[PDB]
Design a protein around this ligand. Structure first.
Ligand SMILES: Nc1ncnc2c1ncn2[C@@H]1O[C@H](COP(=O)(O)OP(=O)(O)OP(=O)(O)O)[C@@H](O)[C@H]1O
Ligand SMILES: Nc1ncnc2c1ncn2[C@@H]1O[C@H](COP(=O)(O)OP(=O)(O)OP(=O)(O)O)[C@@H](O)[C@H]1O
Ligand SMILES: O=C(O)CCCC[C@@H]1SC[C@@H]2NC(=O)N[C@@H]21
Ligand SMILES: O=C(O)CCCC[C@@H]1SC[C@@H]2NC(=O)N[C@@H]21
Lengths: 235, 235
């Protein structure tokens, strides 16, 4: 009854009034490529390292099952499809979303969305949490708060799925294209701090051909960051 | 993201751009009670017996998984929940539908919807096909044709699911209530012919406490028709 006209993403959609986590359901269940798992609310939503992700009613909490036929070296780029898709959807609603490398989107430096990719070999799950009309934790924002009025949640869903389908289809053809879109919509030229096994500060210059964040430290040393288990903090 | 407020029917919804048959999928797949299977188009949609059910884009083709904890003798009334739900939804859109015992809804004697109940294991599958904006076979009709304008498909879905959830919840407690709703909304007092071996004609008088169609033959004999492979024609 939804009438989606996408090629892969959105071929099937499983909607839940409530779920533990769309990412967990997607990783666990036997699902075909392109199936979207979406829920009004999540009771156990999470980000990286099992950190809690607040998922009250009003927001867009979904996961997409992907089976990309691409070399191992290209899989780390899937998170960017989610980040860019969100930025494109936000621009459609006239919201200035900017990417915080490599899995978040901010509006005036406040987090409005997060992306979490999980994958075991053949199946890759692309999880996206976007604050639309829901209450958010301090330090975050939502589409409603930015526009000053409620936004039709289904319209946001339709917009995002359409954008993601296009981005994904092109990714399979030209896996490098997404990097340019990330560059054009990411926060750069400002000081950041990388928190991993130890830490360091510097200017976030750009992302390289592998999607690694290029940081120039005050000494001039250049470091290439692979997100993994590191956190980026703005100064 | 659909924000359904129903109690049982609609707790989960599985949407397909395209499917063979929502009834077939619902029967062969493990699904919790209340799960709704819906598709934009069915390639192998079917009615009773071995007859095709045209399911092009624009219509509402869905199946609902139920596992009613009620006496065995009440189970045959599930088909009526579907028929009455359609009638209630049609009224909301200012269309007057009448039930053609035991599984169809007509508008000015033109078929606008059909109901098909099947069961695998101890789960019951309630299938409903309603013509909304889609083209229909000659002699049939649709919400669009009756209103002279496009009808928001999702609005029809929301309305129908809401009515069905209410009807089902009450059915679980008061399984006889549905019968009076059918009586007040079905075509009675007219001549009909029951096809097949031992065929016969008479006046469709009412439905009894089991949902059987009561027919008075010209001789005065009264026959009780159970709704199975029953083919009925208006004379
Ligand atoms: N609904 C929400 N909207 C915005 N931020 C949220 C929401 N729920 C939780 N958070 C915050 O997001 C964090 C998510 O975990 P995680 O460290 O994996 O995020 P990240 O995207 O990798 O890093 P960052 O929060 O710096 O963008 C939580 O620790 C919490 O501070
Ligand atoms: N989209 C549709 N809208 C209305 N009628 C349809 C549609 N697709 C098929 N039909 C008609 O509905 C019939 C469906 O099969 P089935 O015999 O099981 O229905 P039925 O309700 O028992 O028949 P009837 O109401 O005509 O006595 C087909 O034989 C066909 O004539
Ligand atoms: O910012 C992050 O660290 C990532 C957050 C990812 C949130 C989404 S909500 C849909 C999906 N289900 C989950 O449990 N997590 C992701
Ligand atoms: O009038 C009839 O004989 C019954 C038609 C039932 C049609 C619906 S469409 C949704 C579901 N899937 C099917 O293949 N049939 C039912």
């Amino acid at each position: 009854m939804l009438g989606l006209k996408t090629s892969i993403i959105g071929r099937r959609v499983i909607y839940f009034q409530e779920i533990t986590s769309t990412n967990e359901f997607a990783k666990t269940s036997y699902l075909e490529e392109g199936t979207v798992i979406v829920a009004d609310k999540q009771t156990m939503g999470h980000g990286r390292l099992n950190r809690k992700w607040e998922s009250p009613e009003g927001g867009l909490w979904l996961s997409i099952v992907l089976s990309p036929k691409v070399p191992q070296k290209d899989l780390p780029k899937i998170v960017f499809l989610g980040a860019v898709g969100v930025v494109e959807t936000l621009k459609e609603f006239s919201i200035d979303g900017r990417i915080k490398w490599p899995n978040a989107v901010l509006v005036n430096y406040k987090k409005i969305a997060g992306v979490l990719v999980e994958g075991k070999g053949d199946k890759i799950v692309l999880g996206i949490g976007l604050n639309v009309n829901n209450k958010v934790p301090n330090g975050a924002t939502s589409m409603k708060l930015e526009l000053g009025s409620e936004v039709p949640l289904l319209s946001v869903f339709r917009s995002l799925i359409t954008n993601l389908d296009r981005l994904y289809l092109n990714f399979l053809k030209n896996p490098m294209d997404i990097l340019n879109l990330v560059r054009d919509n990411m926060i750069l030229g400002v000081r950041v701090k990388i928190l991993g096994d130890g830490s360091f500060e510097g200017i976030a210059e750009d992302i390289d051909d592998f999607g690694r964040l290029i940081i120039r430290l005050d000494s001039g040393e250049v470091k290439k960051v692979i997100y993994g288990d590191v956190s980026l903090r703005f100064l």
